[PDB]
C-alpha cells in the first residue's frame, strides 16, 4: 500500500536516506547477473 | 608470424588462433 508506505515513512530526513538505503540494498539482491541460483546440490531459480 | 597473425587478426608462415571477447549486458541500478 503506497499510500500507507508513504504515512509510515512521515516526513524524516533520516527516515528518509534509511529507506533510500535499504532500498537500494534490496534492488541489488533480488536481481543479478545470472538466471537461476544454484545455492546448493539441487537448484531452484526463476528466471521469470 | 606477425603477418600471419595480422591476418588471423583480419609451412613456415605459422597461424595462431584467437581467444574469446567480454561482451554482455547488465541493470544493476
Known sequence: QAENIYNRLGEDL???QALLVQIRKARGTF?????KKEFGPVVIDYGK | ??????????????????K??????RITN
Open chain 2, 20 to 25: 574469446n571477447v567480454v561482451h554482455e549486458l
Open chain 1, 14 to 16: 533520516n527516515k528518509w
Open chain 1, 31 to 35: 536481481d543479478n547477473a545470472e538466471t
Open chain 2, 1 to 18: 608470424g606477425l603477418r600471419a597473425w595480422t591476418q588471423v587478426l583480419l609451412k613456415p608462415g605459422g597461424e595462431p588462433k584467437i
